[PDB]
């Protein structure tokens, strides 16, 4: 059985460090809060969870986390409203995803609600680290790793679950959408049907570093991940992809690829579908999108906006795709971008507690 | 640039562990190699007592799988002399893996010499009973304390050693049965299956469990709509058969992106080519080709190759819920035994060979 929040052990720090100031620009992900969550698993089950001072991990050099990538992570944001209340965005969905990732790598199960409560308690302890300036947030990074001291390629009998926290400044410095250019080269494949691209596993990210460098060398900012003989658009970098257009049947539509194995089921992605479906103003579908369809829609002036979704920026416009040595101008910014702006506005209102919503989990 | 073996620092253990049954991969020797890389380049390499790693919780090795490894064996002959099998090839492969993950390059011969010195320090750990060896596990990991999905500015290269028992205890070769289900995919063209990266292995644990549930020891990894045979577990696959053109041949899949280029694999090709007794070819092999050849009695032996076992016969493949009998063992298995014997004689120093690197 799972670790329990009722069993939480707490150790407050004695060497708190300076919090970064809002005036200094932060590169993402290098500054951490004072405490962390740690829980250890062995064949007899989970130990008691603990909130402890941020500190190093001590791992056996044969730890399967480091040899066979028995590792997975999550990523979600907590937001502090003007009322000073801290709230997590739809964290239940992150817990569901984390558990699915754990089962895929034969890592131990845990109770999703017990972990969520332990994370709440951690953020509570480090509440002062949650910034409240516009467009700022606290990024929460749960990790589960195998930790068997053995070179056998096997299900581990030991594991570690920890959570660390990282305050974040504004993704769009200035407070306004900045479009990105994408390299679409079918030679690079992020994930395959039957593979593990639909789980947030460490192994899906390391191989992308070189491909992202290649995008930069070709004058693009991010990678448009193509899949199959028909060059399906799957994801943009570490963002889910959305296209807002009049479809071939003449109907105004928001489409994003379906969860058929090569798509990471984004929490923001699900939220944009939920939100747009609720409005009931245009068709909202999950369907494959091909480069042939995009090329045709662009030539016929049917595309309004293309954008990525994710925790990192919420919604990110795309203005250009480099495909088969040709630049495709995507007219997103010449169309408002109305839908992008609307999503950003309504997400912000929910996230910073301007309007109450069941999507927000209060800390 | 590179760390230099000339700068190697040695610190001997003050708490030596009692030496050695042996389940693979759980027993380690007294010392390890460690080298750190940061913005000032590579530090000096050190041999230190076996000990835990201390890693920042944001270390990119644990979040984005910036990790790769190697595996090679040292063997102790009757002359008590220890020798590594074709280690230059492992160094070449390690460097290819490092470049693929944007990890720092190093000089292959400098690493090789540091590894030689490590094994030398722990030489009494190398067993000398029949079929036994010392397994050498170099690892290179990213070590940036950042959640950015980026090329690291810090890294760690370490090497640990395991004594290993006989793969076929008692000497008799025993075949493996395979589950062949196209639902499972190990790697894809445009992926990273041809590098020895940690990320390729974690995902196979659940698949292997499913094979065992279906009463099979290992996974036959199929690829493409034509069900190309790619690998057997973590072994390269060979088929010894009379081909459709009437010619007796040894075939293994080509290095087209989904095949990890094994050192033993390359060695079997080299050895068979040297014999000049039958055709040796790298060619795609499909399940339909295999089924036809089996129906027509053209298959002699099917086997996997790898550092773990050198060679391992296959006698059964479960495909589309049907058991395919592979007549490997009924055929000796003559070729498998021949490869096994020659490799053994080379590895334990019974016959001189440039493939062996003395420690
Ligand atoms: C969260 C985040 C970044 C990131 O790399 N995230 C990430 C990491 C691994 C896999 C997927 C993702 C995608 C995701 O968080 O949406 S870069 C970044 N820049 C500014 N502000 C942010 O909040 C931020
Ligand atoms: C080396 C080894 C094993 C292993 O799992 N190795 C391995 C690990 C990760 C990727 C590929 C491989 C394949 C390879 O070493 O040939 S299991 C095993 N059992 C008995 N004796 C051994 O020497 C042995
Ligand atoms: C994390 C991630 C996303 C976005 O998921 P959110 O839950 O919306 O932050 C999209 N694609 C990939 C490949 C990812 O790793
Ligand atoms: C390590 C490995 C092999 C065998 O390589 P050798 O260098 O012969 O030990 C084969 N296939 C895969 C997938 C591997 O990881
Ligand atoms: Cl899914
Ligand atoms: Cl060689
Ligand atoms: Cl190759
Ligand atoms: Cl062996």
Swiss-Prot record, chain A:
UniProt cross-references to Gene3D superfamilies, sorted A to Z: 3.30.470.10, D-amino Acid Aminotransferase, subunit A, domain 2
Tissue expression as described in the entry: Ubiquitous.
Reactions accelerated catalytically: L-leucine + 2-oxoglutarate = 4-methyl-2-oxopentanoate + L-glutamate; L-isoleucine + 2-oxoglutarate = (S)-3-methyl-2-oxopentanoate + L-glutamate; L-valine + 2-oxoglutarate = 3-methyl-2-oxobutanoate + L-glutamate
Record-level GO cellular component terms: mitochondrial matrix; mitochondrion; nucleoplasm
Keyword Ligase listed: no
Major location (coarse): mitochondrion
CDD domains named in the record: BCAT_beta_family
Record InterPro entries: Aminotrans_IV, Aminotrans_IV_CS, Aminotransferase-like, B_amino_transII, BCAT-like_C, BCAT-like_N, BCAT_family
Pfam families: Aminotran_4 (PF01063)
UniProt-annotated binding residues for substrate: 139
Modified residue annotations for N6-(pyridoxal phosphate)lysine: 200
GO biological process: branched-chain amino acid biosynthetic process; cellular response to leukemia inhibitory factor; isoleucine catabolic process; L-leucine biosynthetic process; L-valine biosynthetic process; lipid metabolic process; regulation of hormone levels
First-tier enzyme category under EC: transferase
GO MF term set: branched-chain-amino-acid transaminase activity; L-isoleucine-2-oxoglutarate transaminase activity; L-leucine-2-oxoglutarate transaminase activity; L-valine-2-oxoglutarate transaminase activity
PROSITE patterns (alphabetical): AA_TRANSFER_CLASS_4 (PS00770)
Modification type N6-acetyllysine: residues: 292
Entry keyword set: Acetylation, Amino-acid biosynthesis, Aminotransferase, Branched-chain amino acid biosynthesis, Disease variant, Lipid metabolism, Mitochondrion, Pyridoxal phosphate, Transferase, Transit peptide
Record flagged with keyword ATP-binding: no
Entry's EC annotation: 2.6.1.42
Cofactor(s) needed for function: pyridoxal 5'-phosphate
Its job: Catalyzes the first reaction in the catabolism of the essential branched chain amino acids leucine, isoleucine, and valine. May also function as a transporter of branched chain alpha-keto acids.
Family listed: Belongs to the class-IV pyridoxal-phosphate-dependent aminotransferase family.
Assembly description: Homodimer.
Medical condition linked: Hypervalinemia and hyperleucine-isoleucinemia: An autosomal recessive metabolic disorder characterized by highly elevated plasma concentrations of valine and leucine/isoleucine. Affected individuals suffer from headache and mild memory impairment.
Name of the featured protein: Branched-chain-amino-acid aminotransferase, mitochondrial
Organism: Homo sapiens
Lineage of origin: Eukaryota, Metazoa, Chordata, Craniata, Vertebrata
């Amino acid at each position: 059985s799972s670790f329990k929040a009722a069993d939480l052990q707490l150790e407050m720090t004695q060497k708190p460090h300076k919090k970064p100031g809002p005036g200094e620009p932060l590169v993402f992900g290098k500054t951490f809060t004072d405490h962390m969550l740690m829980v250890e698993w062995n064949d007899k089950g989970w130990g008691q969870p603990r909130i402890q001072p941020f500190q190093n991990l001590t791992l056996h050099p044969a730890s399967s986390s480091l040899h066979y990538s028995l590792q997975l992570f999550e990523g979600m944001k907590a937001f502090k409203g003007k009322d000073q209340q801290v709230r997590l965005f739809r964290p239940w969905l992150n817990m569901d995803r984390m558990l699915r990732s754990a089962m895929r790598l034969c890592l131990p199960s845990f109770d999703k609600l017990e972990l969520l409560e332990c994370i709440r308690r951690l953020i509570e302890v480090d509440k002062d680290w949650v910034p409240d300036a516009a467009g700022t947030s606290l990024y929460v990074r749960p990790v589960l790793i195998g930790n068997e001291p053995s070179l056998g390629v096997s299900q581990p009998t030991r594991a570690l679950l920890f959570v660390i926290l990282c305050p974040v400044g504004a993704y769009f410095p200035g407070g306004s959408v900045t479009p990105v250019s994408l390299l679409a080269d079918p030679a690079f494949i992020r994930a395959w049907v039957g593979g593990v691209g639909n789980y947030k596993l460490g192994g899906n990210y390391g191989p992308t570093v070189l491909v992202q460098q290649e995008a930069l060398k070709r004058g693009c900012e991010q990678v448009l991940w193509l899949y199959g003989p028909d060059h399906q658009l799957t994801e943009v970098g570490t963002m889910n992809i959305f296209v807002y257009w009049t479809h071939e049947d003449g109907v105004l539509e928001l489409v994003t690829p379906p969860l058929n194995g090569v798509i990471l089921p984004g929490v923001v992605r699900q939220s944009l579908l939920d939100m747009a479906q609720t409005w009931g103003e245009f068709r909202v579908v999950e369907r494959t999108i091909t480069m042939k369809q995009l090329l045709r829609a662009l030539e016929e002036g049917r595309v309004r906006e293309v954008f990525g979704s994710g925790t990192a920026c919420q919604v990110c416009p795309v203005h250009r795709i480099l495909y088969k040595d040709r630049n495709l101008h995507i007219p997103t910014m010449e169309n408002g971008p109305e839908l992008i702006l609307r999503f950003q506005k309504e997400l912000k209102e929910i996230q910073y507690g301007i309007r109450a919503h069941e999507w927000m989990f209060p800390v």
